[PDB]
Structure 1
């Protein structure tokens, strides 16, 4: 009838992954009654404007030849470095490849992806260049943006030696710095559920229609293989690329976070479901849904044109991973920041494993499965109230734990022992104008 200590600890670590109070890790409060090992991955990366040695081409230049460094096209990217730039970070629920970084000369109208699969996507210290016309970049084209993936290798090693996994919590911090008199720019952040699934795209099979004139064995092989078949299955994310511009996100989502670039960001990625079942590790190629062009059978058409119906473009990322289902996708934009910026990315990903026999994880085991329905219900209720992000230095929220968690703990059903904890008022997270009020009306003076 009351929340337990383990449930409260899990709630804290799930809502505030990078909070200083959260020191020890706790499992999902469902009493799974299995041997589990909880792993906490804390990583730090120092992203800035890349030098020429870290830039690689994605076009047909690097087709079978591995990554090709940029050759004196770096002058154009220096031209970028003359003015203010834009930096997007996209946190898909992929376990490896925690975030994807992108550098733009100026804010795009959408989060575009290339129709052709890129060659050798680069991991964080290296970047890969994409052309300005939304295509892969070969040397001698016009560079459009730079893209990189932030990779966690220990996660891969541990996922190999695990029978089941489940993501417990994830948080990304963006401590931003710049030279004095160059602290311009704005930061926006937003989470939203992009429920991916294993899908195949409709491709066209090449046909052999050949009315041959062979001497005597003229088969006249009209083998009409011009049929639509299904490509290989891929995990496809319904990421609305065309609506990922910062302004669109600010208008759409109420809990979106906006501030000055110097405030950085701190996004605790939240789940979208009340249950977190274990899943077997199953890496698969990732892809992102696009938009369809030919209406096809969306209008009264013939039988022949059913095949070219509404077919949504699938953008292959040339990256394989296993995703955490029902976890929100985060996206943050740094618009108009100085090209001499420096972003310290700090990611914390804590997730539970079921070790396989004779594996490394078996030596680090937590034999304490707890059960707490109240904590799960409270998290489900709080899902829609918490802001999508906070300033980078706004950890250790005072209002959390025994005020927010408590004041939200009697509402679930009537499972209540304490009559009234604290009335809950609508907070105003106006970080831009410094008029910030917490969940209980207490003002938040800037402590960082």
Structure 2
């Protein structure tokens, strides 16, 4: 009838993954009664404007040939460096490939994605170029943007050796810096659930046409294999790419975070569900789910037009991974950034494993199947009222824990002993105008 210590610790690391006090690492409070090993991956990447040597092309040029650097089309990308730029990060719930970095000459109207599968998507220090017309880039085209994946290798190496896993928490911090007199820019952050699923797109086969004209050979096998079948199963994410523009996100979600660029960001991605069960590792090809062109049988049609129905485009990412289901997809945008910026990305991913016998993880297990129902209910309660992100320097929340968690742990049901803990009001997170008030009306003087 009261939150335990372990449940409270889990709640604190789940809501504040990169808070300074989160030193101990604790598991999900459900009493799984299974030997588990919890791993904490902290990584840091200094991302800036890439030089030409780390810049490959995804077109059919690098199709069978390995990665092809840019044949000194880098002049156009220098032209980008003349003006201000835009930098998106997209944190899908994939376990490895923690985030997708993307660099634009200027803010796009939507999070476009190429129809054709790219060639050799590049891990972070390298980038891959895409054309301005939303197609893959071969040398001699017009570069549209740069893209890269931030890859955690230890996560792969450990996920190989595990019966099951579950993501405990994940946080991404964006310490931003730029030369003095060029600190201009804005930052926007938003989380939302993009519930992926294993789907296969609808494709067509090819009808064989043989015309034997020989004196005895007159078979004429004109049989039509050109029917509609299902492609490979892929894990498909329904992120509304057309609606991931910054302004749309700000006006849609009330917990979205906005600030000047120098504040950076700190996104503690949150689970969208209430239970977090173990899953066997299942690396699959990831794809992102587009829109449909032909209305098809959305209108009265014939049998022949049942096939070309509302089939949504599926954009292959050419990246395989296993995803943490029920976790929010995060996205931040930096607009009007000076091209000679410097973003220090810090990712902290803590996740639980069930070690496979004889594997490396077996030597690190740590056994307390603690149970705490109240912590889970409190997390489900708090999901809908935490801000989506905070300034990069905003850690060690005074309101968290002894105040917010305690005040909200008395609401669930009537599992309450303390009569009243503390009144809870609606916080006002106006970082742009320095009028920030936390959940209890206390103001927030600037700590950076």
With the shorter chain as reference, the TM-score category is over 0.9
SS at match of 1:10: helix
Question: Structure 1 residue 353: deviation in Å?
Answer: 0.1
- Inter-partner Cα distance in structure 1 for 2:126 and 2:72: 17
State the 1:134 CA deviation: 0.2
Per-residue CA deviation, residues 326-384 of structure 1 (Å, 9 max, x unaligned), is 00000000000000000000000000000000000000011111000000000000000
CA drift at 1:116: 0.1
TM-score norm. by structure 1 comes to 1.00
Distance (Å, rounded) in 2 between the aligned partners of 1:438 and 1:174: 22
Q: CA deviation at 1:210?
A: 2.8
Alpha-carbon offset, residue 298 of structure 1: 0.3
Summarize deviations over 1:246-293 as a string: whole Å, max 9, x none: 000000000000000000000000000000000000100000000000
Alignment of 1:318 with 2:318, yes or no, is yes
Q: What's the CA shift string for 1:302-331, capped at 9, x where partnerless?
A: 110100000000000000000000000000
CA distance in 1 between partners of 2:375 and 2:223 (Å): 62
Q: Does 1:89 align with 2:89?
A: yes
Query: Matched residues in 1 for 2:334 and 2:322: separation?
Result: 28
The secondary structure found in structure 1 opposite 2:320 is strand
- Deviations 1:179-215 (Å, cap 9, x if unpaired)? 0000000000000000000000000101103333133
* Shift, 1:171, TM fit: 0.0
Task: Tell me by how many angstroms 1:217 deviates.
Answer: 2.3
Give the structure 2 partner of residue 438 of structure 1: 438
Greater shift, 216-225 or 274-283, is seen at 216-225
RMSD: 0.5
**In the alignment, is residue 169 of structure 1 matched against residue 169 of structure 2?**
yes
* Inter-partner Cα distance in structure 1 for 2:60 and 2:188: 35
Runs (5+) with no aligned partner, structure 1: none
Runs of 4 or more consecutive aligned structure 1 residues displaced over 6 Å after TM superposition: none
- In structure 1, C-alpha distance between the alignment counterparts of 2:214 and 2:315, rounded to whole Å: 43
Q: Distance in 2 between matches of 1:217 and 1:19?
A: 79
Q: Secondary structure at the match of 2:232?
A: coil
Query: How many residues matched?
Result: 448
In 1, the alpha carbon distance for the partners of 2:86 and 2:119 equals 24
Q: Distance in 2 between matches of 1:64 and 1:153?
A: 25
User: C-alpha deviations, 1:131-157, integer Å up to 9, x for none?
Assistant: 000000000000000000000000000
